[PDB]
Amino acid sequence: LPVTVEKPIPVVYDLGNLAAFDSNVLDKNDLDSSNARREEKIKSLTRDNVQLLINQLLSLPMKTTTESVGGTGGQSSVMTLLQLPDPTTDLPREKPLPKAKAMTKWEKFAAKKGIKPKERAGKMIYDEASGEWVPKWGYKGANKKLDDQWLIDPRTLNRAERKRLVKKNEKQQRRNMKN
Amino acid sequence: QNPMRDLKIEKLVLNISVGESGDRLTRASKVLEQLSGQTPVQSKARYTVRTFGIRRNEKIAVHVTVRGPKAEEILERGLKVKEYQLRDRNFSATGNFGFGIDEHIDLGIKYDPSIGIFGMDFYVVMNRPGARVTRRKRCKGTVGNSHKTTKEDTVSWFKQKYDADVLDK
């Protein structure tokens, strides 16, 4: 029934990973495999550490919500969730930060010339002939008009020019990560 | 001794294969619908074949699967064409069997002048009760050796049921 258990050296906490690091004095003669009171000793010691950890942890700030059960991706109104801090202990990352993506020559052009990047209004543009909104590109895009428009074949000429401009765009981009 | 089991018929399947894909296929679907009393299902070309100009996903053949008393009745009509004789090599190593005929009228259709002389294939599958253990979704299993239907078993079943006119076993 005691819960306020203490020990001479204080315990540091990393509540972000739910860890408590003890730094008190341990004796070899209490822990080695000669001692058959080994497991009880270790269980008691780690019980004490867990007891302090939970004492700090339940005494955290904690948030509770008013959202119904059938909400979206969160906690329900009934359950009060402890709000954990960031992990104090510093641990090695898995991969280097993704900063390795470079900067291209179009961007230098757009920074020298007073270029402002376009707004993303959308794929659809007004086809003034047919009174519809036709997308610029993609599925029946407004650039695949001459392919089946009813007026050597000029249609194939457009298709070849357009396809080789696509080839050019890829050709230019694949030289940008050599920069 | 056999606990009431027998070579019961699961289903016979009626194929109408065509070297082409035109209105003849719709005619064949119509005749199969009229015969079996069910809407048939067209079969898409497996792979292109230039001998008859087969092109993939084109509809070559129609077929219908029929079961139960209707299957018994239509197979009974069919062997009347055979006059209850059929050559032995029809009988599978798995107990199954089938046969073919070049016509529709003899097994019970009027000429119907649009429906000309068109062909048809029977094939009948037979397995003892308990065949579900292969088909059921959960706890799928394989039918045991003493349960599997064999060529000789279908031979005996054909003998005792319809007639004894296998040709050259």
Binding site: E67, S68, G71, T72, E119, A121 | -
Partner: protein, 65 residues
């Protein structure tokens, strides 16, 4: 008024935020008490300006519900 979303004439006017006929503006609908499924309450919503405020004085918009 909370923002100007789209002036149909040109994006330069939207950047300038001019209110003319047909401009899509975002309005503070918190008075209207619209609540979306999931319990969040809607306090910002689009509206198209249906008049010419230069020659009416006021800006009259209809809500895009």
């Amino acid at each position: 008024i909370l923002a100007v979303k789209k002036n149909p004439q040109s994006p330069m006017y939207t950047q300038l935020g001019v209110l003319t006929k047909g401009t899509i503006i975002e309005v503070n609908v918190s008075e209207l008490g619209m609540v979306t499924a999931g319990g969040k309450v809607v306090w910002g919503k689009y509206a198209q300006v249906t008049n010419e405020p230069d020659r009416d004085g006021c800006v009259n918009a209809v809500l895009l519900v």
